[PDB]
C-alpha cells in the first residue's frame, strides 16, 4: 500500500527526510520503465506502482507542510507563508 498520513505522523524529521529519497528513486525508476514501455509498443507491467509512489510523496508533503504551517502559527501568527 502507499503511505497513509497517520503512518507518517509517527516518523521523526530525519526519517521523513530519508524516506523522501527512497520514494524519489523509486519514482524515477517507474518513470523510466513507463517511457521505455511506450517506446517498445508493449503494455507496462503493474501500472498501480506509479499511482502508489505518487500518493506517498504527496502524503509526505502534507505531513511536512503541516509541521511548518503549525509551527509558523505558533511563532509568528501569520497564517499564510508568503507575504501578501
Amino acid at each position: 500500500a502507499s503511505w497513509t498520513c497517520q503512518q507518517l505522523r509517527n516518523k521523526s524529521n530525519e526519517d521523513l527526510h530519508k524516506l523522501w529519497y527512497v520514494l524519489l528513486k523509486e519514482r524515477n525508476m517507474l518513470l523510466t520503465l513507463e517511457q521505455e514501455a511506450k517506446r517498445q509498443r508493449l503494455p507496462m507491467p503493474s501500472p498501480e506502482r506509479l499511482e502508489k509512489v505518487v500518493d506517498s510523496m504527496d502524503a509526505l508533503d502534507k505531513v511536512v507542510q503541516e509541521r511548518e504551517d503549525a509551527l509558523r502559527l505558533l511563532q509568528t501568527g501569520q497564517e499564510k507563508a508568503r507575504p501578501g
Binding site: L73, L74, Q75, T76, G77, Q78
Partner: protein
Amino acid sequence: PLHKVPVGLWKQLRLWEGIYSRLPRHYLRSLEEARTPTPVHYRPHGAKFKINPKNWQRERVEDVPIPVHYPPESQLGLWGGEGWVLGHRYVNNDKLSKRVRKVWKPQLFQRELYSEILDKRFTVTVTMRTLDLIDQACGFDFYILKTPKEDLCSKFGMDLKRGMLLRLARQDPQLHPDDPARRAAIYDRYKAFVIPEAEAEWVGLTLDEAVEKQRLLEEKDPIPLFKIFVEELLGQLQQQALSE
C-alpha cells in the same frame, strides 16, 4: 431579474459595511447632511410666493441652483466658492437667434494671505469674491473658521481649517514660542471656535484620507498563538490551584 436594493442606495450601503463602520460617528454625520451652498452665480429671490404678472394669481416659487464647474486648480486655491459656469447663450438675446455654447471663467489673481493661527504667509490664487469675504469676515483665519465646508470648496481651505483648528485645540506652545502675551491675544479671540481634540484631526479629511488614517490606527500585527495558548494554560492552572 432585478436588484434587491436600488443603485443610488448602493453608494450609501457602501458606508454601512466594512472598515467604514469603524470610523468615528461625528465624521459620518458631518459628511451625510449637506447644508446648501450660498448662491454665488445665480441670484436668489427671497419670497416663497410670487404674484404672476399676466395670470394675477399667487404662484409657488422655488429656487434651483445653477450647476457650476470646479477645475482641478481651483481645488488648490481659494476661489470664494465659485468656478466655471458652463452653458449656452442666445446671440443678441433674442430667443429667435442662434443658440451657442459658452463658458464664463472667473477672474483669478495671485495674492498673499496672513495667518495668525498658522503664523505664515501663503501665496494663494484668489478671486475678487474671496477677498471680499475675507474682508467681511474681518480676518483670514476668521474667514476660514467662520465658513462651512460647502462654501470653501477647496481641499486647501479645509486642510487649512483642519490644521489651525488642531493648533487651537492642542494649545500649541510652538505658535509664538517666545511671547506668551501674543499667545494669549491670538488664542483668545478665536476661543469662540474651540473644538475638542478627537474632532479636530478628522475635520478636513476626504474619504480616502479617512480610510487611510483609520487603517493606520487599526494596524495590529497578529498575536503569536504561543501567547494566547500560554494565557489559556495559566488560566487553567490557576483555576485548578484555586478549586483545590
